[PDB]
Amino acid sequence: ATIKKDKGIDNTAKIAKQGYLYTTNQRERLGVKDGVFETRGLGGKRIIILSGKDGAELFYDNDKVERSGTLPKRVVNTLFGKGAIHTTTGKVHVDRKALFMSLMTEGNLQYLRELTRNHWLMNTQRMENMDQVNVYRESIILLTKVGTRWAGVQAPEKEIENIATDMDIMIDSFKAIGSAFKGYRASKAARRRVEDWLEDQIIQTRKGKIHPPKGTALYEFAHWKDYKGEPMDSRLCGIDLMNTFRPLIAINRFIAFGALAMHENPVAREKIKQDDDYAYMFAQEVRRFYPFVPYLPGKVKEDFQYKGYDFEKDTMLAIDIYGTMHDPDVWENPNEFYPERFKDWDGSPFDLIPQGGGDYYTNHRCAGEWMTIIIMQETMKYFASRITYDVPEQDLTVDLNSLPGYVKSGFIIENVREVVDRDLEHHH
Amino acid sequence: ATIKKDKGIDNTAKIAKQGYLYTTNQRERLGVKDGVFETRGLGGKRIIILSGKDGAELFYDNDKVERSGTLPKRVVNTLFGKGAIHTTTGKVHVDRKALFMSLMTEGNLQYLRELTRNHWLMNTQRMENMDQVNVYRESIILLTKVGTRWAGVQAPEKEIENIATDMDIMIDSFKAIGSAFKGYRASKAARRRVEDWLEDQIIQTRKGKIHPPKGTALYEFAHWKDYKGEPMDSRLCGIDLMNTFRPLIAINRFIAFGALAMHENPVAREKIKQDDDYAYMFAQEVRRFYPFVPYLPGKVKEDFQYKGYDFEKDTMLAIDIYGTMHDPDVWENPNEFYPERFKDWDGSPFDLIPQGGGDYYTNHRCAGEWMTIIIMQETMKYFASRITYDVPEQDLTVDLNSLPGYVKSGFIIENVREVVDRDLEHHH
Ligand code: HEM
Ligand code: HEM
Ligand SMILES: CCCCCCCCCCCCCCCCCCCC(=O)O
Ligand SMILES: CCCCCCCCCCCCCCCCCCCC(=O)O
Numbered sequence: 001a002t003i004k005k006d007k008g009i010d011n012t013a014k015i016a017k018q019g020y021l022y023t024t025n026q027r028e029r030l031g032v033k034d035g036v037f038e039t040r041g042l043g044g045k046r047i048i049i050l051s052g053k054d055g056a057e058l059f060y061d062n063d064k065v066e067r068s069g070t071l072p073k074r075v076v077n078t079l080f081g082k083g084a085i086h087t088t089t090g091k092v093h094v095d096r097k098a099l100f101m102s103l104m105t106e107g108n109l110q111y112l113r114e115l116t117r118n119h120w121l122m123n124t125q126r127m128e129n130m131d132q133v134n135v136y137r138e139s140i141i142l143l144t145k146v147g148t149r150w151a152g153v154q155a156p157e158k159e160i161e162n163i164a165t166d167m168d169i170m171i172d173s174f175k176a177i178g179s180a181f182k183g184y185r186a187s188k189a190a191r192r193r194v195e196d197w198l199e200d201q202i203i204q205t206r207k208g209k210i211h212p213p214k215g216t217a218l219y220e221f222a223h224w225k226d227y228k229g230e231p232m233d234s235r236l237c238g239i240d241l242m243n244t245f246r247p248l249i250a251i252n253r254f255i256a257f258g259a260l261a262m263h264e265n266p267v268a269r270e271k272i273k274q275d276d277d278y279a280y281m282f283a284q285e286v287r288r289f290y291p292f293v294p295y296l297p298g299k300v301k302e303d304f305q306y307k308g309y310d311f312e313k314d315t316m317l318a319i320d321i322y323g324t325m326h327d328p329d330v331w332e333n334p335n336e337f338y339p340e341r342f343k344d345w346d347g348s349p350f351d352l353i354p355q356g357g358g359d360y361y362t363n364h365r366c367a368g369e370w371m372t373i374i375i376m377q378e379t380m381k382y383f384a385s386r387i388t389y390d391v392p393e394q395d396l397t398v399d400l401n402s403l404p405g406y407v408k409s410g411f412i413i414e415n416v417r418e419v420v421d422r423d424l425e426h427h428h
Numbered sequence: 429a430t431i432k433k434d435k436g437i438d439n440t441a442k443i444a445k446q447g448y449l450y451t452t453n454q455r456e457r458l459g460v461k462d463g464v465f466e467t468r469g470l471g472g473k474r475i476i477i478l479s480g481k482d483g484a485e486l487f488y489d490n491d492k493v494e495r496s497g498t499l500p501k502r503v504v505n506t507l508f509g510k511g512a513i514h515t516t517t518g519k520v521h522v523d524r525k526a527l528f529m530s531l532m533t534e535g536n537l538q539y540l541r542e543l544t545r546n547h548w549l550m551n552t553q554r555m556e557n558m559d560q561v562n563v564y565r566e567s568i569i570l571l572t573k574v575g576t577r578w579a580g581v582q583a584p585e586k587e588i589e590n591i592a593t594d595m596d597i598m599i600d601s602f603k604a605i606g607s608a609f610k611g612y613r614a615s616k617a618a619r620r621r622v623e624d625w626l627e628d629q630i631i632q633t634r635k636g637k638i639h640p641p642k643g644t645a646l647y648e649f650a651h652w653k654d655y656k657g658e659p660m661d662s663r664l665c666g667i668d669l670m671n672t673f674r675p676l677i678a679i680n681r682f683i684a685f686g687a688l689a690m691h692e693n694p695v696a697r698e699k700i701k702q703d704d705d706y707a708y709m710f711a712q713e714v715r716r717f718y719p720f721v722p723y724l725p726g727k728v729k730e731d732f733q734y735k736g737y738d739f740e741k742d743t744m745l746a747i748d749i750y751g752t753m754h755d756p757d758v759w760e761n762p763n764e765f766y767p768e769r770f771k772d773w774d775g776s777p778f779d780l781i782p783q784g785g786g787d788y789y790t791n792h793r794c795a796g797e798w799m800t801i802i803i804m805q806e807t808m809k810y811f812a813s814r815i816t817y818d819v820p821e822q823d824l825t826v827d828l829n830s831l832p833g834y835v836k837s838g839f840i841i842e843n844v845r846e847v848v849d850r851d852l853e854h855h856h
Contacts, residue, residue, distance in 0.1 A: 422536040
């Protein structure tokens with residue numbers, strides 16, 4: 001056939017202005033029904049947007065799609081860092097992706113679970129004594145302590161908020177989807193400050209001056225050698241060591257979304273309390289329902305055909321992350337928050353894709369998915385059952401046209417109080 | 429018969445100089461074998477020292493023994509505070525003892541267990557970053573945070589060590605067993621500072637200005653009324669509210685003893701790791717084996733006879749706490765540290781008496797025994813299995829002739845490192 005087209009020499013600024021609704025706005029407008037359409041952006045480039053489970057499966061087929069060299073360069077410069085694993089391909093990628101996955105052991109993840117639970121439990125008194133708590137800001141300080149500890153890197157108390165704020169600026173910086181913007185240079189400065197500190201950690205580890213525990217990211221990254229037997233240079237080593245816990249800190253976006261989901265859906269709170277499996281499904285439904293990753297780029301590796309369309313080598317592609325996750329043919333009632341839908345989920349690698357799809361070892365899928373689910377499950381259990389609080393009057397708006405997805409207020413709470421059954425006697 | 433006697437117009441200074449060994453030194457010397465002997469102290473007063481399970485049972489018989497008015501008045505002034513529950517008798521005592529026991533709910537004790545576990549888990553990084561850690565000092569700061577939280581009283585971070593040090597001075601002050609001493613006035617000042625702060629907590633609770641959680645000591649004590657319908661005056665209320673968590677902080681003495689027991693007995697460490705029930709028995713054996721309470725005073729309520737001796741009304745008595753617990757006819761091999769001995773223990777109220785014997789509700793037995801066992805069990809599990817450390821060269825001496833029992837160094841440790849199995853994969 002002939003791919004339907006959003007016309008224009010370059011629709012980059014229209015894509016940015018419409019945000020997470022851009023792709024579905026065009027599909028509805030043009031009546032496309034096989035989840036393929038075309039547009040132009042990033043300086044007049046032809047871009048084919050894929051959606052749906054079959055779109056996702058095609059996008060993660062290493063015979064059809066090539067990933068390297070498709071990320072806009074200002075996004076690399078602020079989100080991932082130059083030379084980062086996201087920018088690698090072929091043998092080099094599978095080699096280094098193996099390093100990242102070797103941190104995802106059952107024992108390291110259980111450590112991560114305990115760190116998250118104890119940091120929340122210990123943060124209760126501090127939250128009780130504040131007048132108001134911005135969950136999005138509070139999460140990000142808490143997660144910075146958890147993630148620095150989990151990675152084996154040193155962050156004394158007086159650096160924590162510095163590091164948090166710098167983390168917050170880097171995660172936010174994908175909003176320009178390749179453009180320079182107000183904050184581009186502030187984001188590069190935050191990246192460099194943190195990169196410097198992690199490169200120094202690496203160099204002190206290699207020189208025997210500090211001793212991170214075996215099995216932590218800092219230890220393993222410092223002492224790793226690639227398949228040619230070479231270690232990563234100290235600067236690239238710090239860059240990829242940061243890709244180990246900057247995204248961890250970014251879970252604060254989902255935590256704010258989860259607190260809002262519980263507020264908009266009071267039944268979900270009582271049910272998180274009563275059942276750990278609902279807490280898991282609640283966290284999965286937060287990652288499906290709320291906006292974070294809009295789409296991801298790649299390009300055609302060699303010519304192929306798909307649903308009757310011809311795909312030409314080096315034509316730019318994009319997998320629609322948000323749109324696939326709100327496609328009614330993929331998720332019934334896609335704009336209702338309904339965690340129980342995961343009772344019926346078959347665990348496909350191609351429909352729950354908020355952090356990528358495909359295969360962790362041979363695709364570019366998020367290495368931290370399991371870590372993300374563990375942290376969200378712990379945090380939501382905490383908020384549902386360990387504390388009670390008031391949600392004051394505030395702007396809880398989530399503007400789907402603005403990247404990135406945020407609760408406008410950051411979700412404020414007040415009158416936090418720990419939940420302790422002190423009159424439970426053994427007669428009860 | 430005729431009670432054997434340590435002769436002297438007054439042997440107070442000899443009792444003090446010999447410490448936890450005084451009673452057994454005299455029994456061996458005089459060949460007593462029914463655990464009764466006599467001496468003079470506290471200004472020429474006749475004192476009959478009882479020991480053994482039958483000594484303990486007699487001492488806690490409310491028909492034979494009267495407790496009120498027997499504690500030396502400088503000990504009341506520094507340890508317990510004037511008007512304290514320890515100084516009450518009859519209906520007034522059973523009434524107020526019921527208040528204290530109503531805090532010992534299964535739900536409040538599980539709260540206490542969680543507080544202890546999470547505070548230790550969170551303290552690991554701080555200990556890892558110190559060069560050396562004095563376990564006795566570190567415990568006492570940690571326990572101050574736990575006990576203030578558990579009691580529902582406010583202690584901001586910058587008061588914690590102030591409060592700790594003041595707690596430490598008050599617990600230490602029973603060493604003069606009635607005498608004025610170097611530090612008497614320093615101990616009264618620490619008592620008054622803490623009493624003032626707790627009386628203010630009480631008054632702000634009654635006036636509705638602060639809102640402690642229902643079921644905490646602060647809430648229950650503030651709002652309690654006695655059997656005549658009267659609440660405690662605010663100053664006495666603070667005094668007895670302090671008897672709710674100053675002794676909790678005093679568990680730091682046992683914690684230091686427990687760390688030393690693990691060091692002197694390496695097998696006990698591996699066994700605490702492998703089994704929660706050994707951890708319980710280890711904590712019980714620390715309370716039996718190491719010196720803390722030497723003996724407690726009372727007096728004869730009405731005339732009676734016991735093992736052939738005549739007991740005259742108002743004759744002063746003392747139950748030998750340390751000596752009963754190291755009597756070979758009560759504990760086989762009483763000076764070997766052997767936790768497994770509690771496999772054979774029948775739970776008698778009269779032989780494991782490191783915090784009193786008899787009945788919690790109608791005797792003056794420690795209201796915080798269960799709390800003490802919970803804290804010791806959690807703390808010993810932590811030290812045995814969550815961290816590893818070095819024990820440097822130091823004076824680990826426990827001078828049994830000096831009240832109170834201390835590890836001379838406070839038990840120093842270094843090179844603390846959390847224990848995390850990060851290479852545990854699900855194949856293992
Ligand atoms: C919690 C700890 C996390 C870790 C350790 C982590 C780590 C990583 C790494 C190393 C990659 C690159 C892997 C590769 O190139 O093969 C990646 C990719 C990615 N991550 Fe994460 N991440 C975490 C959390 C998150 C969060 C909260 C999000 C939010 C949406 C996220 C979204 C993504 C996306 C969209 C990709 C790209 C997938 C693709 O290119 O196909 N990650 N992550
Ligand atoms: C952990 C929290 C603790 C609490 C809440 C607590 C509380 C109390 C209270 C309220 C009393 C007076 C009860 C009455 O007069 O009827 C008492 C007595 C006593 N406590 Fe504790 N205590 C704790 C820990 C300790 C510790 C570590 C020791 C160390 C040996 C100890 C030793 C004693 C002794 C010897 C008595 C006197 C028993 C008697 O007079 O027959 N307590 N405790
Ligand atoms: C309509 C098609 C437009 C295609 C434009 C290509 C622009 C690519 C945008 C890239 C967005 C990446 C979003 C990743 C945010 C992840 C934050 C934490 C996760 C991590 O750092 O790994
Ligand atoms: C040989 C007979 C001498 C009798 C002398 C009577 C002197 C009485 C000494 C009293 C010692 C009390 C020891 C209590 C220490 C308890 C510390 C924490 C427990 C708490 O505060 O409840």
